[PDB]
PDB file of C-alpha atoms in Angstrom:
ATOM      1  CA  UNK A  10       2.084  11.032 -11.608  1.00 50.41           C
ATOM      2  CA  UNK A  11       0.139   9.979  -8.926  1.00 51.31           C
ATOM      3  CA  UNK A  12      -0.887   7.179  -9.892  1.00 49.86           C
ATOM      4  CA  UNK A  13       2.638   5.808 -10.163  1.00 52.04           C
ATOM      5  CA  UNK A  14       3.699   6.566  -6.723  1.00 45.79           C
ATOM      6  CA  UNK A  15       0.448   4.850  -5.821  1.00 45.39           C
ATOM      7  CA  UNK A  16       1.453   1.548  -6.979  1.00 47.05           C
ATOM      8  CA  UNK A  17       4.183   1.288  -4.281  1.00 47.22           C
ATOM      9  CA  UNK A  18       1.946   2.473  -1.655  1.00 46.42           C
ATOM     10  CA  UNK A  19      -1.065   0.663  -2.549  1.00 44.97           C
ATOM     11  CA  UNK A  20       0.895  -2.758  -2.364  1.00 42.81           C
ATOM     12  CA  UNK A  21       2.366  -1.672   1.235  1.00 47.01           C
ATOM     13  CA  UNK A  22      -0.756  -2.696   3.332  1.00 46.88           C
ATOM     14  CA  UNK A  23      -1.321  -5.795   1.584  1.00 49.28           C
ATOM     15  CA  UNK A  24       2.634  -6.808   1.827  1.00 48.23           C
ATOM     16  CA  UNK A  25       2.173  -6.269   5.870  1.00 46.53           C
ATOM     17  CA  UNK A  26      -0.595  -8.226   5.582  1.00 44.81           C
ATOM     18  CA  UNK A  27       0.041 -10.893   3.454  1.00 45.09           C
ATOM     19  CA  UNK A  28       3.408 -11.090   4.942  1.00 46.05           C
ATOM     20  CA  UNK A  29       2.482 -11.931   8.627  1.00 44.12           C
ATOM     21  CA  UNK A  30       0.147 -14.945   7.584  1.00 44.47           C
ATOM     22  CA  UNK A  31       3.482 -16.499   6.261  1.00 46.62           C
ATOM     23  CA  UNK A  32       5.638 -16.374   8.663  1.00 52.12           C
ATOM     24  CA  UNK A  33       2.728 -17.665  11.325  1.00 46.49           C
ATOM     25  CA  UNK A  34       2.418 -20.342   8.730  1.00 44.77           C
ATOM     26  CA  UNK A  35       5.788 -21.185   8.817  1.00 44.10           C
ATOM     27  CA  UNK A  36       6.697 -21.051  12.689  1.00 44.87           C
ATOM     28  CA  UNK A  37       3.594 -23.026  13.585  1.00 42.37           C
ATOM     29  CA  UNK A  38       2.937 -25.806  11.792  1.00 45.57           C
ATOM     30  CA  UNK A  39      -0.336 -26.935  13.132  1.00 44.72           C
ATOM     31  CA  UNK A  40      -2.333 -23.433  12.436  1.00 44.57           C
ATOM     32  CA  UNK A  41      -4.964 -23.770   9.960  1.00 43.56           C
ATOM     33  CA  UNK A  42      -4.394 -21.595   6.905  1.00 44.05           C
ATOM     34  CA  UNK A  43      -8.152 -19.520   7.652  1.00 45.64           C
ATOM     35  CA  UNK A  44      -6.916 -19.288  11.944  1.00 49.56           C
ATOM     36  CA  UNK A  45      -3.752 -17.890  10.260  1.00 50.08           C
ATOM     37  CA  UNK A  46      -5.686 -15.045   8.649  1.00 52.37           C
ATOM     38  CA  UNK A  47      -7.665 -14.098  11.532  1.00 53.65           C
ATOM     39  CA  UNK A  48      -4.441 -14.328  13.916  1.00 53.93           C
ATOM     40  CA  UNK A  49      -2.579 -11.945  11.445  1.00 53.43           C
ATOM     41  CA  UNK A  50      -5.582  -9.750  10.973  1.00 52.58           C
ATOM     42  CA  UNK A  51      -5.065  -8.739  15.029  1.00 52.44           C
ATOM     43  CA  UNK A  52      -1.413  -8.285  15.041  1.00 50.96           C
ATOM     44  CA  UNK A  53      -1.600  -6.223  11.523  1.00 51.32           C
ATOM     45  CA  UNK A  54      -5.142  -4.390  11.918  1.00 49.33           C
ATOM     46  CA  UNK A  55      -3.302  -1.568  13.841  1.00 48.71           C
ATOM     47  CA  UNK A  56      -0.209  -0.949  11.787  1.00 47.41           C
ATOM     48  CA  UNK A  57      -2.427  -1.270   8.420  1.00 47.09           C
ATOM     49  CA  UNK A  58      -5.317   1.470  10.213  1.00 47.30           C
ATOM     50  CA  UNK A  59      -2.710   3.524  11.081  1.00 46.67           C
TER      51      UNK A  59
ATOM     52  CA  UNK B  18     -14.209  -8.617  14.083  1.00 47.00           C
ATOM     53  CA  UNK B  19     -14.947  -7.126  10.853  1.00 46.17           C
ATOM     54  CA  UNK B  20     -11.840  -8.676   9.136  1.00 46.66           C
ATOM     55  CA  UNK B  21     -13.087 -12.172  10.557  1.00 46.24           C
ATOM     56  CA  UNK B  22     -16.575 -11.702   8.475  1.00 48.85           C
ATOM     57  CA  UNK B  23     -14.724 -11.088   5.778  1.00 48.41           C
ATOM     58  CA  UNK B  24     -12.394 -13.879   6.166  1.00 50.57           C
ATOM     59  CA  UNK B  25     -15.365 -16.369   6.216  1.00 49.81           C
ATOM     60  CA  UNK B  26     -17.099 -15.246   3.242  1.00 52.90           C
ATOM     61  CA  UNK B  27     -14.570 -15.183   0.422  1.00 51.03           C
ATOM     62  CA  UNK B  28     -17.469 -14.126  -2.198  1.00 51.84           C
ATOM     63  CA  UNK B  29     -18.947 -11.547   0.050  1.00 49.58           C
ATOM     64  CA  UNK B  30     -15.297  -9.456  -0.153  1.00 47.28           C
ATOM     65  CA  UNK B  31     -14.803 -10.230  -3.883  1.00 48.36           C
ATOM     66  CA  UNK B  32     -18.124  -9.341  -4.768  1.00 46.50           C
ATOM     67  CA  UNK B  33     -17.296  -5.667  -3.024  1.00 44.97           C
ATOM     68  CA  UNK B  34     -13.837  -5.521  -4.984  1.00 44.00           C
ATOM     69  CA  UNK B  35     -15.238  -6.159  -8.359  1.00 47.57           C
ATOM     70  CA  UNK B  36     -17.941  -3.455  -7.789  1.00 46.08           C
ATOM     71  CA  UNK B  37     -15.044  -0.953  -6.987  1.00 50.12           C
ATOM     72  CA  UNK B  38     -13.605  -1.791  -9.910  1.00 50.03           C
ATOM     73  CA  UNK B  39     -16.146  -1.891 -12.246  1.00 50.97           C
ATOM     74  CA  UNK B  40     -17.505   2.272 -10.855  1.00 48.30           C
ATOM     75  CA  UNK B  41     -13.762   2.268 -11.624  1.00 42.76           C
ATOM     76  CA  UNK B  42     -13.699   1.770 -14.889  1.00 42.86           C
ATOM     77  CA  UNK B  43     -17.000   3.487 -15.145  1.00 42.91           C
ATOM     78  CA  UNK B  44     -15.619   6.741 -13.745  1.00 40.21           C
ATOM     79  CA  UNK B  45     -12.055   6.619 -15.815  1.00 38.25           C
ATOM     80  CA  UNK B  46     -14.292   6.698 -19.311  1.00 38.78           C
ATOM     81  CA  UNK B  47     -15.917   9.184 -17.390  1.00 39.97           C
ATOM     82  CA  UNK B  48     -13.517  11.678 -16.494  1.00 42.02           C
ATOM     83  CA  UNK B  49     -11.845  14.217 -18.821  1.00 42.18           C
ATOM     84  CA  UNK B  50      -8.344  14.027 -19.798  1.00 45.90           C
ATOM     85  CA  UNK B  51      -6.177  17.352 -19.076  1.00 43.36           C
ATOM     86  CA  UNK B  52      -2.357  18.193 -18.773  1.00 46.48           C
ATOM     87  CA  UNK B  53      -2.520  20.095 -15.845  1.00 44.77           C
ATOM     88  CA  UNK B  54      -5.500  21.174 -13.581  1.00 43.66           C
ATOM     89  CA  UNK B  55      -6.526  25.204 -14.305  1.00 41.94           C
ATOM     90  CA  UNK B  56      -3.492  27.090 -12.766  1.00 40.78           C
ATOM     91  CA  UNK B  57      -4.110  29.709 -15.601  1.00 42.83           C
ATOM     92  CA  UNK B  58      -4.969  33.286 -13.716  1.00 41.98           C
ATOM     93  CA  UNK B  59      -8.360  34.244 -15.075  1.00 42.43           C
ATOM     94  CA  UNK B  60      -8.250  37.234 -17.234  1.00 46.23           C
ATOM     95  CA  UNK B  61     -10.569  39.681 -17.779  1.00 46.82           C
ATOM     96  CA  UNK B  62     -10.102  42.340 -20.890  1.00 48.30           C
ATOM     97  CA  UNK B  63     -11.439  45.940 -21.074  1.00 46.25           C
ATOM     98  CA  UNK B  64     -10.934  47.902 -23.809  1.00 47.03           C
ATOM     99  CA  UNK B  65     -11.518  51.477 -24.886  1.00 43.13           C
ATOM    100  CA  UNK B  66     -11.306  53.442 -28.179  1.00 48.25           C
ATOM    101  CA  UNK B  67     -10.008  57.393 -27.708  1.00 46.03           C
TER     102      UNK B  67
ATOM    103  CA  UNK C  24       5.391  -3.799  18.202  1.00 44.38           C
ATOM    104  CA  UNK C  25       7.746  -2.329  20.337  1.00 47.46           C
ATOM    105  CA  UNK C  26       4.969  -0.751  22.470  1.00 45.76           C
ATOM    106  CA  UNK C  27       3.079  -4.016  22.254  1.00 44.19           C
ATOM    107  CA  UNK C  28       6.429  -5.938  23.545  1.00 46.11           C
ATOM    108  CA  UNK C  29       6.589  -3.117  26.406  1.00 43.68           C
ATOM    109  CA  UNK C  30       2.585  -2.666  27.513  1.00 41.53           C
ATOM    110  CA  UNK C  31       1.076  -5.991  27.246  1.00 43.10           C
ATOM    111  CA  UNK C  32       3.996  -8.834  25.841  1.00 43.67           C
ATOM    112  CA  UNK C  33       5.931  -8.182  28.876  1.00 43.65           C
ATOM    113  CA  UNK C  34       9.367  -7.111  27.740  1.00 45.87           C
ATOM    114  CA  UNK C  35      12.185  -4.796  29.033  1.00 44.48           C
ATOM    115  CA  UNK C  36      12.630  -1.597  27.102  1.00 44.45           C
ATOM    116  CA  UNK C  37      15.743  -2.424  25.660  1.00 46.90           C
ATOM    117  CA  UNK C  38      14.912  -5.795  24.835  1.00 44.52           C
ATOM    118  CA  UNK C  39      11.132  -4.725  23.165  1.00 43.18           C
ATOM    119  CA  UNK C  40      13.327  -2.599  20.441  1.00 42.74           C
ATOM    120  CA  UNK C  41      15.565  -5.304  18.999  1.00 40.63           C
ATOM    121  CA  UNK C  42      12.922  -8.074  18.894  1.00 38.99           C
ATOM    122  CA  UNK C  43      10.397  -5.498  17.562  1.00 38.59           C
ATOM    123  CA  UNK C  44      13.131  -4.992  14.901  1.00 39.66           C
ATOM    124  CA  UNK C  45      13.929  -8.362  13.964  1.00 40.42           C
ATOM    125  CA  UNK C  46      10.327  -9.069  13.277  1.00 41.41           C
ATOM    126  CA  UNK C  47       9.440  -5.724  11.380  1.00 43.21           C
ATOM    127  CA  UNK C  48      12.241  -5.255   9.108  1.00 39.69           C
ATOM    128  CA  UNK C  49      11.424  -7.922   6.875  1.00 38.75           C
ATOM    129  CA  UNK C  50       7.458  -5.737   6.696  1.00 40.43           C
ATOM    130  CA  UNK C  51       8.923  -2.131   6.406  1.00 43.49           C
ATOM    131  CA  UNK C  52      12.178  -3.225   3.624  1.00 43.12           C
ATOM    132  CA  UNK C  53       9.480  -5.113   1.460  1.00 45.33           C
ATOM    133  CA  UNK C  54       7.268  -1.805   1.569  1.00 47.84           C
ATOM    134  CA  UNK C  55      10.051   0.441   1.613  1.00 48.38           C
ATOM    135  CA  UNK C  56      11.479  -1.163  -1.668  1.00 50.70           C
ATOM    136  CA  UNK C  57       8.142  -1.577  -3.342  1.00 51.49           C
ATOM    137  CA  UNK C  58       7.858   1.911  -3.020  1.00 51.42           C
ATOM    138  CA  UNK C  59      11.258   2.621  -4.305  1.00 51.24           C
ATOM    139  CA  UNK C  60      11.533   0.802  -7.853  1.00 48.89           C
ATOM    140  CA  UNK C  61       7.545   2.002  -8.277  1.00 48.80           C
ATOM    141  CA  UNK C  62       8.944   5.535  -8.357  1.00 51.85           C
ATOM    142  CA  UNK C  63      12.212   4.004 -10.342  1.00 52.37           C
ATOM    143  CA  UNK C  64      11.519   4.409 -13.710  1.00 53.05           C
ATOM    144  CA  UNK C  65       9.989   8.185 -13.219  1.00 51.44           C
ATOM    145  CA  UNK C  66      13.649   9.002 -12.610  1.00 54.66           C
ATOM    146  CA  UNK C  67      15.198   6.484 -15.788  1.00 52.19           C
ATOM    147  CA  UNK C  68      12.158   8.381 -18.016  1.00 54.74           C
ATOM    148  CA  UNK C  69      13.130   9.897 -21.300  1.00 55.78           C
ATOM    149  CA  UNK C  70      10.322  11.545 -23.671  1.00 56.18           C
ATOM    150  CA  UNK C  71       7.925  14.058 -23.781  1.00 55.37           C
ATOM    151  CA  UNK C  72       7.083  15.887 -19.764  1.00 54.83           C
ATOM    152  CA  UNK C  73      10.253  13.801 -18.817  1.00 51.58           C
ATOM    153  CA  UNK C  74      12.232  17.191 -16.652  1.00 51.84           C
ATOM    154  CA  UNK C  75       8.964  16.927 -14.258  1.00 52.18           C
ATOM    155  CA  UNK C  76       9.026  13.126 -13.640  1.00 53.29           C
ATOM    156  CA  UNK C  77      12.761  12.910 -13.017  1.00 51.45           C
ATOM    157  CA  UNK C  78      12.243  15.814 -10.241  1.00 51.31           C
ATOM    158  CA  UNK C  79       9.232  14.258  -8.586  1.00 51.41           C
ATOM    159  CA  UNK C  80      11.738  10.869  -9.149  1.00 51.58           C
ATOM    160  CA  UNK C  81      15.195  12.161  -7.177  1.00 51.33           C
ATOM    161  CA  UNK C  82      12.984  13.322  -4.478  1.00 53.55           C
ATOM    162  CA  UNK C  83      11.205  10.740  -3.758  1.00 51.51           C
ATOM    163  CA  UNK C  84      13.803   8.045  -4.367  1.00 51.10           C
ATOM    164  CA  UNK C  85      16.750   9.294  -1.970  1.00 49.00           C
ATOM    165  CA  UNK C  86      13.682   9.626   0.896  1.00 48.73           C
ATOM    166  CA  UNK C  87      12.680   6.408   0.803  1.00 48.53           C
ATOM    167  CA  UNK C  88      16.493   5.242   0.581  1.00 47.04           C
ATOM    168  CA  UNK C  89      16.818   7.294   3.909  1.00 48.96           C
ATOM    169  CA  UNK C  90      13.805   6.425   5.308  1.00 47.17           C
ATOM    170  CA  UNK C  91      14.463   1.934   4.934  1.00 48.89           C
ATOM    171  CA  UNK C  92      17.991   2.824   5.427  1.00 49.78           C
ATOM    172  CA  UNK C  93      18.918   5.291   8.323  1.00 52.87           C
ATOM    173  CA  UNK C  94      15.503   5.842  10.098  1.00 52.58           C
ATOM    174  CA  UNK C  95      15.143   1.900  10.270  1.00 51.10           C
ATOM    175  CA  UNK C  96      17.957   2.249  12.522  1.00 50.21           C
ATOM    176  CA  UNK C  97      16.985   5.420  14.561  1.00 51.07           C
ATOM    177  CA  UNK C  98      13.543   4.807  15.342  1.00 49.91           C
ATOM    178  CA  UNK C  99      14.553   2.013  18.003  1.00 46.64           C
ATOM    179  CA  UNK C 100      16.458   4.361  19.835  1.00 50.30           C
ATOM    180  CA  UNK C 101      13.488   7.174  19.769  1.00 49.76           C
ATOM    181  CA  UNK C 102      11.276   4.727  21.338  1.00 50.29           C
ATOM    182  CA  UNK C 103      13.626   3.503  24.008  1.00 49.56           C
ATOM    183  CA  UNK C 104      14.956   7.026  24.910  1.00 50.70           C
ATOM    184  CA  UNK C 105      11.428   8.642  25.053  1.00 46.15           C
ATOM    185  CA  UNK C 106       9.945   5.267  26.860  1.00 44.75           C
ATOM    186  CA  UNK C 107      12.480   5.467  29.775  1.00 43.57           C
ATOM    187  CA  UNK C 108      11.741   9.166  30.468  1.00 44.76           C
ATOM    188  CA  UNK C 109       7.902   8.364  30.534  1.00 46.49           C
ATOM    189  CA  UNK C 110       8.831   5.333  32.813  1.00 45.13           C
ATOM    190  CA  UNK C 111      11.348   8.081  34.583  1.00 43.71           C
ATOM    191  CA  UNK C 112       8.179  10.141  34.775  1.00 44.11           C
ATOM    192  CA  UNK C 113       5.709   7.408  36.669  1.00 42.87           C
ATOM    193  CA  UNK C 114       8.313   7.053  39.530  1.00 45.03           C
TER     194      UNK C 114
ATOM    195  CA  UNK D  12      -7.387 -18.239   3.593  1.00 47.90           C
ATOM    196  CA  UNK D  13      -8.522 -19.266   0.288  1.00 48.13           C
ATOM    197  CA  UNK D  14      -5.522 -19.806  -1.690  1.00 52.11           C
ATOM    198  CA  UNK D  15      -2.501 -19.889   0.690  1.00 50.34           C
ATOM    199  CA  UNK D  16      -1.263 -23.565   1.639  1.00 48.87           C
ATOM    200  CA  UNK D  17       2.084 -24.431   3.569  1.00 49.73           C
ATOM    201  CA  UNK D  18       2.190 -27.786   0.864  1.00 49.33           C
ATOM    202  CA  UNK D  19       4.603 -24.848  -1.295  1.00 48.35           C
ATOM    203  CA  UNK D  20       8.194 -25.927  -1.512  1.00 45.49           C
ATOM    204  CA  UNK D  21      10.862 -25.245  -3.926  1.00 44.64           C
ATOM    205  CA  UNK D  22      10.926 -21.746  -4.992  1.00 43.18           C
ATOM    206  CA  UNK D  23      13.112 -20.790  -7.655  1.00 44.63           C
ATOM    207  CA  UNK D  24      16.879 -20.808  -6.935  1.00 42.94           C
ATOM    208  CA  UNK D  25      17.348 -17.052  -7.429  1.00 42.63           C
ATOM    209  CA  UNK D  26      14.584 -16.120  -5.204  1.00 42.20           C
ATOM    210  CA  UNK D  27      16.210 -18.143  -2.707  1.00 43.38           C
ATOM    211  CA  UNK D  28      19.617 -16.927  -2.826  1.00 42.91           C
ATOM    212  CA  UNK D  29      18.004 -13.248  -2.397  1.00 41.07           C
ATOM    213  CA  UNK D  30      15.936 -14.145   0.336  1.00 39.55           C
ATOM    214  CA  UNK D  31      18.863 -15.593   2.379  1.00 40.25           C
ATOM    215  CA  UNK D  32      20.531 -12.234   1.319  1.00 39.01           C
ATOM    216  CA  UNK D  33      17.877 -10.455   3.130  1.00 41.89           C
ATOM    217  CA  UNK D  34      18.013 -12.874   6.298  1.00 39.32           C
ATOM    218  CA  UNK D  35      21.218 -11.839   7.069  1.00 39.17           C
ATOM    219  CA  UNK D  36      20.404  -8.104   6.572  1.00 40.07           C
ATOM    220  CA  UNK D  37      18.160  -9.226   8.778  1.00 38.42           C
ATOM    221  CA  UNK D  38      20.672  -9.814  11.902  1.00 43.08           C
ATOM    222  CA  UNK D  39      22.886  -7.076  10.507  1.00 41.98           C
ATOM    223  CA  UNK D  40      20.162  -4.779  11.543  1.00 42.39           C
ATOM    224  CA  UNK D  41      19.269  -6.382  14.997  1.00 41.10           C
ATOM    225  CA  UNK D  42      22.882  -6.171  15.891  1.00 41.16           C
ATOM    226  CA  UNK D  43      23.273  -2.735  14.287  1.00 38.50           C
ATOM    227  CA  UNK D  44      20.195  -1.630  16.445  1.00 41.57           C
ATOM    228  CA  UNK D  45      21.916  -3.357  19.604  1.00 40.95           C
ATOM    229  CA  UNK D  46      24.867  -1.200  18.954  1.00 36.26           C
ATOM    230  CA  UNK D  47      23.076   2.010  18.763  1.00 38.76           C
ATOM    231  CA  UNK D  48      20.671   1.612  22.027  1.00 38.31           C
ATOM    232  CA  UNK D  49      24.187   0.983  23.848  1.00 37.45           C
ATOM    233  CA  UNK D  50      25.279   4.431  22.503  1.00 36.75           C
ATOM    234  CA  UNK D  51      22.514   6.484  23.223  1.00 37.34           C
ATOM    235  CA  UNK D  52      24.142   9.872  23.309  1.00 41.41           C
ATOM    236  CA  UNK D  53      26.818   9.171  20.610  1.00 40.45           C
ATOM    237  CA  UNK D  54      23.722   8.216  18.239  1.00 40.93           C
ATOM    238  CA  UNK D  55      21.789  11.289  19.422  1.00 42.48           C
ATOM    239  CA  UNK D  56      24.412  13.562  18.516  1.00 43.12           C
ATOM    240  CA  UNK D  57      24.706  11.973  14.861  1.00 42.62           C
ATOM    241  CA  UNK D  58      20.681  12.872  14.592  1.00 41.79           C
ATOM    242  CA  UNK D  59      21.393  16.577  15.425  1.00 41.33           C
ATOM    243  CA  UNK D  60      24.342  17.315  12.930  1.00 39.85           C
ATOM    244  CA  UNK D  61      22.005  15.818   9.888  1.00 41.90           C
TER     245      UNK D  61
ATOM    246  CA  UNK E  18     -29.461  15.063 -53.092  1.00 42.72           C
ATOM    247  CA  UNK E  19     -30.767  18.108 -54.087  1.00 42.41           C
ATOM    248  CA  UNK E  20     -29.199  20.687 -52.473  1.00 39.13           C
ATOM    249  CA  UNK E  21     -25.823  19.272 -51.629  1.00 38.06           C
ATOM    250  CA  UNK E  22     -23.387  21.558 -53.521  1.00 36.94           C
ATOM    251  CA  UNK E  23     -24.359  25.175 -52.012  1.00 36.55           C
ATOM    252  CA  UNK E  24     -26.948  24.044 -49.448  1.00 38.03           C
ATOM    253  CA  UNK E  25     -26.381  22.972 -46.254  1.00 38.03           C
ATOM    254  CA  UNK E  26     -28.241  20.720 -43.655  1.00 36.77           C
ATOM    255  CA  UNK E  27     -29.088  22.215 -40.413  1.00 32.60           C
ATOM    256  CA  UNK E  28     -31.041  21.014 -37.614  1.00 31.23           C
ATOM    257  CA  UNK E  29     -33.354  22.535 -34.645  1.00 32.76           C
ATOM    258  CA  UNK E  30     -34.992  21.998 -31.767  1.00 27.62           C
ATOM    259  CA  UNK E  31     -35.233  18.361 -30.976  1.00 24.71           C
ATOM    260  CA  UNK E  32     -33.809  16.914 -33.862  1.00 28.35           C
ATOM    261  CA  UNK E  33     -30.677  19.344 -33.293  1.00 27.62           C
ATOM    262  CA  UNK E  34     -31.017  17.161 -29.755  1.00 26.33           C
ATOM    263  CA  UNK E  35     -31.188  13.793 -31.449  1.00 27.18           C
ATOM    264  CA  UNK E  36     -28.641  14.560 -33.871  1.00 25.56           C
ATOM    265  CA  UNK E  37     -25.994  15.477 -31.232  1.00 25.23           C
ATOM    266  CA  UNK E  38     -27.007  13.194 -28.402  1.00 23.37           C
ATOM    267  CA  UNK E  39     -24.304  10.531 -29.334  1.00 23.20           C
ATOM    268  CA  UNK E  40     -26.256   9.095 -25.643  1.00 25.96           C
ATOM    269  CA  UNK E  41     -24.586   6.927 -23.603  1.00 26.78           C
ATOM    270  CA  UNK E  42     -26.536   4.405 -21.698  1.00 29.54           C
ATOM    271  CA  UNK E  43     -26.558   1.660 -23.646  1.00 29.24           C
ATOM    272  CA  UNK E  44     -24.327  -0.227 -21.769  1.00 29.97           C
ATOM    273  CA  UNK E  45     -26.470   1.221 -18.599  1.00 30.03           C
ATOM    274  CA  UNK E  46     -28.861  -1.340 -18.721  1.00 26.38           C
ATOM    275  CA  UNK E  47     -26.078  -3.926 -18.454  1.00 25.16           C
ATOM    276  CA  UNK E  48     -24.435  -2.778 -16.064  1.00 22.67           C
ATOM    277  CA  UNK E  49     -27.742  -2.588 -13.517  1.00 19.18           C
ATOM    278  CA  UNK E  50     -27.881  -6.436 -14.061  1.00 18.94           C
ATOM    279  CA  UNK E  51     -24.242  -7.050 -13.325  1.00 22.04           C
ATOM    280  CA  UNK E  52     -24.596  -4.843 -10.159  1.00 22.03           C
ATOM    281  CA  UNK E  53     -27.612  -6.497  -9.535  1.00 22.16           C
ATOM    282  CA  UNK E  54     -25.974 -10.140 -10.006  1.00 19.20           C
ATOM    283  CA  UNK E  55     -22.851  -9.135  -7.545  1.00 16.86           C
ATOM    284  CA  UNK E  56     -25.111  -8.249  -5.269  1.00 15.44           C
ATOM    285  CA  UNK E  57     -26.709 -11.112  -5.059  1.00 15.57           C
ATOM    286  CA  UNK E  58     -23.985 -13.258  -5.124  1.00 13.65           C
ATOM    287  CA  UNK E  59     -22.809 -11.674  -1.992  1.00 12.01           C
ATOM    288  CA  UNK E  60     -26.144 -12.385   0.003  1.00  7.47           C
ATOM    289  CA  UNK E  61     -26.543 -15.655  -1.535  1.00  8.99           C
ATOM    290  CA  UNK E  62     -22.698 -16.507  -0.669  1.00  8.36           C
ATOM    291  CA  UNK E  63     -23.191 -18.536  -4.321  1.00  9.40           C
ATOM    292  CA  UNK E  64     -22.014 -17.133  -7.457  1.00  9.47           C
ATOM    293  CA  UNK E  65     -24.399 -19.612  -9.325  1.00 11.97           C
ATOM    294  CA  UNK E  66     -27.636 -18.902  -7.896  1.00 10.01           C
TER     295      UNK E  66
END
C-alpha cells in the first residue's frame, strides 16, 4: 500500500526539480541548458533536502 | 557542489541509478511475500490431565 | 522562497509572500496533484482487500485536497504574521 | 542537462489548453493571497473555527 | 525401478543437502561482472571501455 502512495511522493522532488530548469530556460534565453541545471540545483537543493 | 559533479558526469550518476536498481531487483526476488506483518499475539499452550 | 525574498533578495514582507506564491504554486499543485490521482485509484478499487484501500484512499485524498487547496492559501499569511512579530521583536 | 533543449515547440493542443487553465489559477491565487494578507485577523479567525 | 511400488527413496546427510539445495547463485557470477562493468564505466566516464 505503500508503495502506491510512494509513486506520488517519489515524483515530487524530481517535479521541483525538473520544473525550475524550465522555467529558467524559458525566461532567459541565453542560459545554456547544463548552467540551467546547476542554477536550479541552488534555488531547489533546499526545498528538495528539506 | 555535489549536484554540479553530478551534473558534469552524466554516466557517473546513471551508473549509481542502475546499481540501485539492479540490488533492487535483487532484493524484491529476495524478500518473502506476506499479507500482513506478524500482529498475531504469540500463544503459548499448557495443558494438564486430572 | 519567501524567507529567501525577505533575508537575502531584498523584499518587503508583504511583497516576499505573493511573489513567493506566484513562483511556487505551479511546484507545490504539480506535486500536490501527483500525489492525489497516485492515491486515486486505491479509493475507485473493487476486489479482493478492497474495504482497507478505500480507507487508506478517503484519507489521504481529502488531505491532500486541503493541503493544495486551503493551506496554499494560509501559509502566506503564517509567514507574514509570524515575520512581522520577529521584525516587531528586533526593534 | 543531457536531454533538455529549448528547440521544443508545439505541444499537443490539449496540454496547452490545460496549461493556460493552470496560468490563470495561477493569478487567481496571487490575488487570492493579496486578499488574505490585507485581512489578517478576518483570515485568522477562519483558521481557529476549522 | 525396483522398489518403486512400496519403497520409497530417501536421502541423508549430504546428498539430503544436494537434493534440497535448489542453490541460487548462478546468476551470482553475472551479476559480479555487471557490477564490476558499472563500476568501471563510472571511473572511466566511457561506457565502452
Amino acid at each position: 500500500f505503500a508503495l502506491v502512495l510512494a509513486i506520488g511522493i517519489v515524483v515530487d522532488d524530481a517535479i521541483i526539480v525538473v520544473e525550475n530548469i524550465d522555467r529558467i530556460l524559458h525566461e532567459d534565453s541565453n542560459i545554456s541548458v547544463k548552467d540551467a541545471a546547476i542554477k536550479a540545483m541552488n534555488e531547489v537543493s533546499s526545498p528538495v533536502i528539506s | 557542489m555535489f549536484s554540479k559533479f553530478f551534473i558534469e558526469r552524466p554516466i557517473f550518476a546513471s551508473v549509481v541509478a542502475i546499481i540501485i536498481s539492479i540490488a533492487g531487483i535483487i532484493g524484491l526476488a529476495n524478500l518473502p511475500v506476506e499479507q500482513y506483518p506478524s500482529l498475531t499475539p504469540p500463544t503459548v499452550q499448557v495443558s494438564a490431565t486430572y | 522562497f519567501a524567507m529567501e525574498e525577505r533575508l537575502k533578495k531584498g523584499k518587503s514582507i508583504f511583497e516576499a509572500a505573493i511573489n513567493a506564491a506566484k513562483l511556487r504554486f505551479r511546484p507545490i499543485i504539480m506535486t500536490s496533484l501527483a500525489f492525489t490521482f497516485g492515491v486515486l485509484p486505491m479509493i475507485f478499487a473493487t476486489g479482493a482487500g478492497s474495504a482497507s484501500r478505500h480507507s487508506l484512499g478517503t484519507g489521504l485524498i481529502g488531505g491532500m485536497i486541503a493541503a493544495s487547496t486551503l493551506a496554499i492559501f494560509f501559509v502566506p499569511l503564517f509567514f507574514y504574521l509570524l515575520e512581522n512579530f520577529n521584525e516587531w521583536l528586533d526593534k | 542537462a543531457l536531454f533538455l533543449t529549448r528547440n521544443e515547440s508545439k505541444p499537443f493542443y490539449f496540454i496547452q489548453k490545460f496549461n493556460d487553465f493552470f496560468d490563470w489559477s495561477t493569478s487567481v491565487f496571487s490575488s487570492g493571497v493579496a486578499y488574505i494578507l490585507k485581512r489578517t485577523i478576518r483570515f485568522v479567525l477562519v483558521f481557529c473555527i476549522m | 525401478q525396483s522398489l518403486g511400488d512400496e519403497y520409497s527413496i530417501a536421502w541423508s546427510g549430504s546428498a539430503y543437502q544436494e537434493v534440497s539445495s535448489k542453490g541460487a547463485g548462478a546468476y551470482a557470477f553475472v551479476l559480479g561482472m555487471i557490477f564490476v562493468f558499472l563500476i568501471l564505466a563510472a571511473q572511466y566516464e566511457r561506457w565502452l571501455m
